[PDB]
Symmetry: D2
Subunit: 259 residues, 4 copies
């Protein structure tokens, strides 16, 4: 099978990468970073997010694996000590796969993006006012610092810091959280996080300024003359190679409660 390995670039991750390549050399496995069917990320969740976006046009043909050489990650959830066992079981194939939902972001001026964690919209220069439209009905006029739309696996990241709920990634949904909303006699927002099912479309529309900072995972670019930002659960999914059982709620416990 064709495989590739990305590295955070520090000494630990690079040497683990070279060792796994050597281990793969003892099997019917070909290193190919153009059309791999297995993508191994060695580093942290940030390294994994970059590997996902490096290959987001071949998502249906790739099984992803994350190894954490630092603290436990939610995508980088296997320890370096297990790398030799990962080489053997990856080479045999026949492992199971698990799929997590993704967020589709459409920016009309169109450009479309996939997020594994979230997409956010923030004020560029000055106040941030957007009309929030849900399935073509005007829901609220938001004024504040910004808005965050999270995938299920993204709920443990930015979403969590904004008061959002943690959602098991088997649920096909997206979650919208507020950043420092104003509420007074003029403006009124819902306050609570909002959780949307598949096929629901949330549209952000400018009121005055048409320039915002729009993020998709780690990528953050200033977008000019934007007329609309549309969010919906993607029809595409990210696929993980299933090594063993590491339940989502145990990863939550190990990351935030104790380990």
């Amino acid at each position: 099978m064709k495989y590739m390995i990305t590295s955070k670039g520090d000494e630990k991750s690079d040497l683990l990468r070279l060792n796994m390549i050597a281990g793969f050399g003892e099997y019917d496995m070909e290193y190919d970073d153009v059309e791999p069917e297995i993508v191994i990320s060695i580093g942290g969740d940030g390294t994994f997010l970059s590997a996902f976006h490096q290959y987001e046009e071949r998502l249906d043909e790739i099984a992803f694996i994350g190894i954490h050489t630092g603290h436990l990650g939610f995508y980088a959830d296997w320890r370096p000590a297990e790398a030799d066992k990962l080489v053997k079981l990856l080479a045999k194939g026949e492992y199971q796969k698990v799929s997590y939902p993704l967020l589709k972001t459409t920016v009309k001026y169109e450009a479309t993006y996939l997020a594994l964690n979230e997409s956010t919209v923030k004020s560029s220069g000055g106040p941030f006012v957007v009309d929030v439209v849900i399935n073509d009905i005007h829901f609220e006029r938001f004024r504040g610092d910004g808005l965050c739309m999270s995938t299920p696996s993204g709920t443990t990241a930015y979403n969590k810091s904004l008061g959002g709920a943690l959602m098991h990634p088997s649920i096909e949904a997206m979650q919208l959280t507020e950043m420092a909303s104003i509420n007074n006699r003029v403006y009124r927002t819902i306050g609570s996080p909002l959780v949307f099912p598949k096929h629901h479309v949330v549209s952000l529309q400018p009121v005055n300024d048409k320039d915002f900072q729009i993020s998709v995972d780690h990528l953050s670019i200033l977008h000019r003359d934007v007329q609309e930002i549309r969010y919906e659960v993607s029809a595409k999914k990210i696929h993980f190679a299933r090594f063993r059982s590491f339940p989502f709620w145990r990863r939550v416990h190990d990351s935030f409660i104790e380990d």
Copy 2:
């Protein structure tokens, strides 16, 4: 068809009830409060919750309808002015039905209950400490005022006041929120609301005191010698007669944003 009408009991709801019965008398419709196939609640969401529990053993054979004679409700979402149109379309049948998920609560000392809004566990006398177990793995030791497990349609009720997310009721899930959790060098909880899919089981287990106040919707009873409280999405669903399109997110907007 067999039908029954429950009333909040004030002048407005009682006379609307008598008028609808008279209107139903002009059709092939029989008043039966033992085995109705249509249950109409006239009052508020509290009146509707009582109608649901009056007939929770025949849920699969009943279509519920709520009329609000006060402010707009989330279950009582039709106005008294539409009552004559409701009589005509209910008598013809062939209306569509919509189903919302329910929460199954099991109390072991077993007793099982269904909630349309939520079930909560609170301290009876003294401090509240419970071990939270998710799918048989210990997740956290909670110390504080209590815990709330909400259905999707319950998310706009107690859940909302506790910081929970609002979830569209097409999502088959339950949501767990904390009430005033202690977090210091001794105890540690997740803080965030937790959203669980079907077939996930959340178990609350006593640490010292075995007496708690357990609520299911409006019913709140003191339960002695409790050994466990188990939550999971019910296999049963409540069925609403679908009169017209009143989207969930519009009901959210009308109730909390403006109307």
Copy 3:
């Protein structure tokens, strides 16, 4: 000087108490639990709160000291290893004193209480609705689980779990936090914690039910036919014997950040 020592009652605290009494026996110090001028609490913050209330009628004549035989406390902030040094410096006198503000609670049916942490008002049986009146002007009609009025040193306790601010105890103020307030088309509360200076009077007044559960620190009693609950910063203060410098913000850091 007259002194007394209270104990949590476990083996550790009792034997530390007996050892300190023996150490005090080597000085001009008399054990008196009727009119002590020095009150030493050995246990935790709960033990200290009970010592404060045991002697709250002689607050102006007592310097309090707390020793924690378990985890660090905010009132019980000296370690057992320092007990022999505490005996020597307490016997000499001439130590400095520090004073923390207290909360005066008046319950009219009058009865008055002093709180070192907080006083709370909760629903007894059924819904909790109270009118909140600030300096005789109606501020809000609160509906929800209850309200909490905290001293500065209480802000790290119940107040913290309810989202309240942590206030340095040199500030003469009280802080009001909400417990699970309802906000919809009917009811409207401020949401935010409220911080009041001296001489401001916050009055809670019943709307329907006149029975509530009222707490003052660890004491919680059901109060019948209550017509009003009045909160204001007390003119009385608790006095601590100042052993050395242990800044409030360092106690916050050691308790909640790391130690």
Copy 4:
């Protein structure tokens, strides 16, 4: 007396300004925008904030007055209908004055600023990590979107949207709130708002990046090679001309509860 009037610049505020100048022309009152002793702001709270900063070097010699030609403001709290009565009572003098505390911000690379609402520190490009030091002791390493330090009268503004407490402006304090803090196995922050008395110094210190966006009220500038940001309650105060009794808590009620 020397007076000046600033205007939001819309038709309503400009014509009200010209009418008040005409009214002042009937008294011993001289228009001077260089050394006024009375500064009248006509517009909203934003207009008032700009008037404060236009004259922040003569604060001890100026009494400020705010008139709101739109919705009620917290500084612009008098209605246009009262303008003719304001002219008469301002011309006589002998009115009372009320003083609100201010926040002193020191930026070391030094530059010092006064805030009437708040000062905030946010990430410029990339992640935001700062060490928080309280009275020279390291309190926490904050990672997240930013931090906000509010005056008492600022607590109803940005501070409120970030979960901060509302503080009566007679309290000489400042309040620190977090913006989307990360909390996991790596980082740990207090979470709660922090309220500091006079003479307490809160210092923000860079960890990696030394470039941040620093705001003081409406002014927001990018500051390069910053080594420290120091916050403390200013020794200076803003003085308002006291027209009549409009209590702070009533302004809170009228702005956020109902009016």
